């Protein structure tokens, strides 16, 4: 398949590039990193596009990309509801172009959060916890966040947690994502982890992802590169293409 | 729902009598033990049957119980390809009447063995700890090797686990179900406690099922007792009534 | 070993009273609950006694025994520095009497604070995870607190846990005993579990106990039971003797 | 302190030749790898010597080394009885001389067996699981089997773990190290861990120790350099430099 990458200096774009060499089956039809001209992607015949420029210009690419029918696989945050709308929009003069926009790349991540999520329900209690090295800004990570938004929105309509804590120390329990208590663990030697912890009266159920890399968000935008194509307009989120639903 | 129990006196039976009884949206309508004449189910209109009967007996009730259109959770094993073939055959003349067939109703260990199945192609590793009480007569368990037959045939055409050891101990190792480690640890203090994990370079996910109770299956019963109805025919394994979208 | 029990109709005595019959080496020599008079134990030439009254009347045991040469091993809480420095005081008359007081008999739960202790010094960053049933009054546990203190006290004189979090969520970083983390997961299906971490770059350490029963205190006052003899005069808290070379 | 490197162009020399030259409060006073006399140690008033060259050699630097009253750091393997022997010999002329050699300097991996030896005398069970890249050769670790030996041989005089498994797969129950089970994970993703499992009935204690880098010996072999001096002759391991005994 004919991959280009954008803002390919950019730590991100830089390993796509090297993944995409590497890469048996496809191949690597342009390399633009930021003072490049869009322009191009098409002399090359780029039939997919890896983006993960800053916020302020992934609109500006967006578009161009899906004028020329190019299919974009997006890491790019900064998306509101408003932005999702946008590229709904565009993508309506283009039927046979494929966007697919994702907060995270990582498989295990991915799976880690669909499986919380179909768990959610059959649980009294869950809690995550997250372990990062002491060098992460932000408590709980963006990851842990949007993990329990999932799962208390997969329980809406059970009772909250039991919990029968009556004096405690300040922050013993945890934050309180939407109703759903969230841990972080900084620790020297560490680099990302979660731990979705669901119990009930007689069993628990435990889902651990560990990332040991910067770089496995990799194998994702791979995936998601080869399969692009078998669905047309807007997907959110990776999980539709690891066919799970 | 009207609720009838079989094999009533055996330890599961007993236990869905007091289960149905404790359960407010349900009422328990006929509870035999082997012997007592069937009959006594339709003569108390009873709608969905509990069967934990011995291997031997099943047959000959899942024939009464279809033929008098009454919905079946069936938890004896002893189950094969030609015994559900059969099954399926009596369905066919009472389209109306549902049966499942589950080898397992603990909804922690059916989920887990889900989320096996789904993770287990995007991995390159794969491997199951199985850790259970010093008085459990077989290694690995039922429910470990179930599941690595399952992470073996989601695996069908990708590589085997990579593996460079070259001098061992017996056993080191541990067992070969289909390809796939199934280590067994037996242990004081535990109950029955099982780890999938699964590894590829940069990222690790892991989930663990941890049963505590003889009694944890019977959320599931309940729960298949109160939807069985939703899916005609035979239904093989409780996943499908999880509701999975 | 000839051996009395006090507050004989509480749960813990009740638990000792068994506990005392059923081993082999041991007998039971008397056993009083709050007001039968204490007379009883020398009549019937008790050796050692298993304290858990109340903390109102500890004291007033205390004496008698220590007044007596009779050994102790005593489980009650509510001791004060005043309080053992009170014990410490009757025990200089009598040279030959043993006491132990100890704020946790689980053997697993002594050792797994020692161990922390022990490491506490050699890592840069450490914290504390208690998991415990949803029914738990307090939050972090008795236990999680001494232990959180231990490592503190060890740790005087090295740089705080190093931690760069600049935004959260009020909590998400749990509580603060003495500049170390202490989170608390309340979960159905749990009973008394704790995690403590350890990590510095390239190397992380984790001890976990898990506490699945009321009574895995006993095998410890059985020990301690046996071996108080060893050691004159007042010991506190069961490590001296796991005799530890 | 004035350190000197042996073997310095080999991966570990050469690490701690920078861990040395970064570090505070130590000056490296020579670099010598292969082909280097050993008198230049000497002439640059070496103090101690960290040592990590082949087998073959070191007999040959020791003797050198204890000649001249420098300290010594060993990290070579292949010790056998009879070569301990012969360093303990050496050492008689040199009594103000301290050799430390210890096959492990991982202070996590130290504590962590230090901690399984002292546990395992208490717990009915004991087992170690212990997981790696899938590029290692060899299953179990060294370390776990070192780990396994040691636990045996503090339960000497223990029953063995209970165990009721009669029909099994081979390699289920795991390696037979010394009577206690060692299972092997290799999992792509995974550097070095070890796991060590105890229990009895109401409770487990679980040691971890996970090494993420190659690179995590160095704390250690710095702690031994900044400390070998209080030790006068042979030190087998390096647990005693840490202050546990
Ligand atoms: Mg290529
Ligand atoms: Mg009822
Ligand atoms: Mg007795
Ligand atoms: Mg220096």
């Given at each position: 398949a004919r991959v280009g990458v954008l803002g390919a200096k950019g730590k991100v774009g830089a390993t796509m590039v090297r993944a995409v060499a590497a890469a048996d089956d496809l191949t690597l039809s342009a390399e633009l990193d930021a003072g490049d001209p869009l322009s191009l992607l098409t002399d090359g015949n780029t039939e997919v596009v890896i983006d993960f420029t800053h916020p302020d210009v992934v609109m500006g690419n967006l578009e161009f990309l899906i004028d020329n029918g190019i299919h974009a696989v997006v890491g790019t945050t900064g998306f509101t509801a408003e932005r999702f709308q946008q590229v709904e929009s565009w993508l309506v003069a283009?039927?046979?172009?494929?966007?697919?926009?994702?907060?995270?790349?990582?498989?295990?991540?991915?799976?880690?959060?669909?499986?919380?999520?179909?768990?959610?329900?059959?649980?009294?209690?869950?809690?995550?916890?997250?372990?990062?090295?002491?060098?992460?800004?932000?408590?709980?990570?963006?990851?842990?966040?949007?993990?329990?938004?999932?799962?208390?929105?997969?329980?809406?309509?059970?009772?909250?947690?039991?919990?029968?804590?009556?004096?405690?120390?300040?922050?013993?329990?945890?934050?309180?994502?939407?109703?759903?208590?969230?841990?972080?663990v900084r620790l020297a030697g560490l680099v990302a982890h979660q731990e979705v912890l669901f119990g009930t009266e007689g069993e628990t159920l435990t889902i651990r992802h560990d990332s040991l890399d910067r770089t496995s968000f990799v194998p994702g935008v791979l995936l998601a590169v080869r399969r692009i194509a078998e669905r047309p307009g807007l997907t959110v989120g990776l999980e539709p293409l690891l066919d799970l639903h």
């Open positions: 283009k039927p046979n172009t494929s966007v697919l926009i994702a907060p995270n790349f990582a498989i295990g991540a991915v799976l880690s959060m669909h499986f919380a999520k179909q768990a959610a329900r059959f649980f009294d209690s869950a809690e995550v916890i997250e372990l990062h090295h002491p060098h992460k800004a932000d408590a709980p990570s963006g990851t842990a966040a949007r993990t329990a938004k999932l799962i208390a929105e997969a329980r809406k309509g059970l009772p909250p947690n039991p919990d029968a804590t009556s004096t405690s120390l300040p922050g013993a329990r945890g934050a309180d994502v939407d109703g759903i208590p969230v841990h972080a």
